[PDB]
């Protein structure tokens, strides 16, 4: 079958769907990855077929989606979140991008559209051709969680009092292509999850789950990784968060290194300068392939994003999470902490001493390792990518007459 | 499981094994590709994890393997073929390359080694750690074909006259790593085939067969390709052949184009300029991904190589083949021809006129498309890459 996969130009959201693209490819299907022209090189570097759509995105040059306090989750708040993000997401998948993707769907006529959850050209293109479409998550389903609340609230207001910014947005987006607003434009014929069911939000809709494979991008094994591990290793990838905060970057690095293990730390040229002389047991590296590193690590310290935490899940590695707030990191961090698999320090509570002490516990108390391994066992038992391709074929077949 | 794949530094031979590497990957196995340092970038640019081994290879800078006449296939001929190719293959996977891949295997403990069929460091590394290994073909098994004859012809020699250049070479190759010679060093614990059984040589050993996925590196669909075609499209990939060959490139281009169809031709910039003004119905291009062009094509003209022909099989496209005779192109073109799915023009016989006339046949006689489509049917029945991953698990378990 022909699968049209679409993702806005962002390498992380691309890598999120690379293993699924390739599972579909090696089972025999023809897979096109459609994205803005600036994502073409990344699609190439992943071994896949790029179909450029729209103009370069260049996405790099009050109302949040991670809000979970019940009192803040009013109809008016979620309404306004929807109004704002409807604009942002439009920007991220253009009328040009959307027209190019519809034109390709009409020409190629795919049997399944799989769209990155932030890429709303996906469902417009799919519906121009009655292909069933799968909304692919890239962490927890914040948008579906808010959408469920919103639709529950809406169905109990007066009828004249149910403005829906998503309906106005997506009816508008679909209009030039004869695509009518349905609710399935918002959340997909169905949704594919990348996070394990035990940490996901309850949904009023079903979600396929999957033993998510964390694609780390092109990789060359360095010599130093090739050598028999000397003694316990810890992986430190908190570079970005650390520059943010009289208490110095060197101070943070000296404390974090003061533990019974070798540290592999990812740092800029900028940061390696800013921190000056490194401790003895620290190797600074601008990038490391986690799947080559993590099998030998007693801990990983990181900002709680999906790619890195899926690697700690897959390799059974305890975590020290300093959550960022780009998507779901705070909420997932607490889920791991509750299972005994992680220790958390919020950004506002960050001291060198606090990180070191947490790291020392992860290293010393084997309960964290056991909990991380238990997590790994339950992940290994999720449906394989081959099983998932089998579900996706049932979606495209069940989606046909 | 851990799978150590290895291939000498040639992109085509890497590409041969990329979709398998990725089948293995998405099934959850840990996959390393070991190749000389000058091939590490192509490995990482196909999305996989490279392990550099050995020194840069730089491969670009009467005794043939493809000899099939039985009057020529004497023990002495085959003996001398094995004496000459063992030197060539030793060169392509060094005592340094072999020592680095052995040391990596010792440390990483792969469960299974898969080695490109020209990459003889593989079985040494595999035997050094006692892991089983699969020899992965990149076309027909010329070497297996010759070895079958040789081993039999050797059997009937006086014991004192049974000199085996392959046993000598691989014995020497393994000895620093404590690997004694055994015939599994020559042909693998088992062999994985990429060509369909219908075009294959008879082998004394079974090979796993496979519904081969052709990969050719970066692939971007150009915009000119999103229109429905408005009549037969032809794909012309003979730039290299016409280059090494009164008649001007423009003579060829002009005749090949003299048909009722649109030609898409891959030509260097140097070639486009010195072929001069192009006919209306020809579009010169650097490269085009074949797997996206061929669905709309009535014919492909090519040199009969493994990746392009696997594409022709997969999309059921009739072929005009002008064989290279590098590895197996001559034998394979004849097989395609005998099935009614291709017409063949040997290089000594190549003239703008012949290309032209064969090209019209392919477009206008429905028997060729029908035969191309039967081939595709049969390809569709071969074991999926998923099945193949299951067979390779069994191999690793035994
Ligand atoms: Mg014959």
From TrEMBL, chain B:
It comes from the Bacteria. DTDP binds at residues 12, 216, 287-288, 290, 303, 307-308, 311. The keyword Transferase applies. Transmembrane segments: none annotated. Residues 253-393 form the Erythromycin biosynthesis protein CIII-like C-terminal domain. Keywords: Antibiotic biosynthesis, Glycosyltransferase, Metal-binding, Transferase. Belongs to the glycosyltransferase 28 family. This is Glycosyltransferase. The gene is vinC.
